[PDB]
Amino acid sequence: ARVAVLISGTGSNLQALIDSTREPNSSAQIDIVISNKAAVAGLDKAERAGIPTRVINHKLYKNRVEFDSAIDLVLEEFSIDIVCLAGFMRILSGPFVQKWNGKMLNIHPSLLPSFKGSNAHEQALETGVTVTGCTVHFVAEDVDAGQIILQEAVPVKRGDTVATLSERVKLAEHKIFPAALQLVASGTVQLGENGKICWV
Ligand SMILES: Nc1nc2sc(CCCc3csc(C(=O)N[C@@H](CCC(=O)O)C(=O)O)c3)cc2c(=O)[nH]1
Numbered sequence: 001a002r003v004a005v006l007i008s009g010t011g012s013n014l015q016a017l018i019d020s021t022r023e024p025n026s027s028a029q030i031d032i033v034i035s036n037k038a039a040v041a042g043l044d045k046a047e048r049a050g051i052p053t054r055v056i057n058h059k060l061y062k063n064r065v066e067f068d069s070a071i072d073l074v075l076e077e078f079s080i081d082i083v084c085l086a087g088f089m090r091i092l093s094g095p096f097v098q099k100w101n102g103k104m105l106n107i108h109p110s111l112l113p114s115f116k117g118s119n120a121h122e123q124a125l126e127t128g129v130t131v132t133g134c135t136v137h138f139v140a141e142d143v144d145a146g147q148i149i150l151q152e153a154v155p156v157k158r159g160d161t162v163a164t165l166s167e168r169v170k171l172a173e174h175k176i177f178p179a180a181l182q183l184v185a186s187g188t189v190q191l192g193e194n195g196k197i198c199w200v
């Protein structure tokens with residue numbers, strides 16, 4: 001399966017996906033890295049890995065569908081089968097999500113359905129959970145509500161900040177998101193006809 005990785009920043013999840021998809025048994029290949037922001041370190045990680053990069057600055061587009069259509073063009077150009085959102089921070093438009101229904105994965109730094117949104121760690125610490133985690137889910141139109149592929153719990157330690165908690169959670173993220181990509185790329189998991197996760 002041909003994979004596009006959409007990034008917005010540092011790209012540590014991208015790096016974990018690169019490493020896993022170069023394993024001999026990997027069923028996924030990363031063929032393009034799209035960043036909506038220039039000079040983010042994720043572009044350098046891809047360039048050091050030989051992977052083509054495209055920057056598609058969302059601020060240059062009139063609305064969301066024009067920005068998404070620009071992404072979709074690169075995806076068709078590279079004949080992409082699966083899209084991974086790895087720290088990509090722009091909410092995607094309905095028609096784009098519908099087109100890629102069942103082919104788009106997102107990594108979210110909480111145990112969904114808890115702490116949806118852009119600052120899951122802040123919410124987790126504010127709430128005082130002692131267990132958080134990360135979620136790989138299929139992207140549905142409703143943000144952070146698509147079907148869940150894999151999760152992994154991560155303890156919150158006394159004294160944790162966003163810095164120490166997200167560093168611990170990212171260790172789990174870099175496990176389940178390569179695993180989740182492999183499940184989908186190998187056709188082991190799909191969004192079923194009933195819309196829930198189907199382990200075929
Ligand atoms: N249809 C649909 N689109 C998307 S995009 C995505 C991955 C990112 C999740 C996210 C969760 S809050 C936030 C967000 O607030 N984005 C802001 C920009 C803030 C920033 O630049 O840091 C905005 O777009 O205005 C993005 C998941 C997802 C989905 O599940 N369903």
Ligand SMILES: NCC(=O)N[C@@H]1O[C@H](COP(=O)([O-])[O-])[C@@H](O)[C@H]1O
Nearest residue numbers: 009010011012013086087107108109
């Ligand atoms: N709403 C999604 C979200 O908050 N994304 C989170 O941003 C970080 C990006 O790190 P990276 O750029 O090093 O992969 C990751 O923790 C990812 O789960």
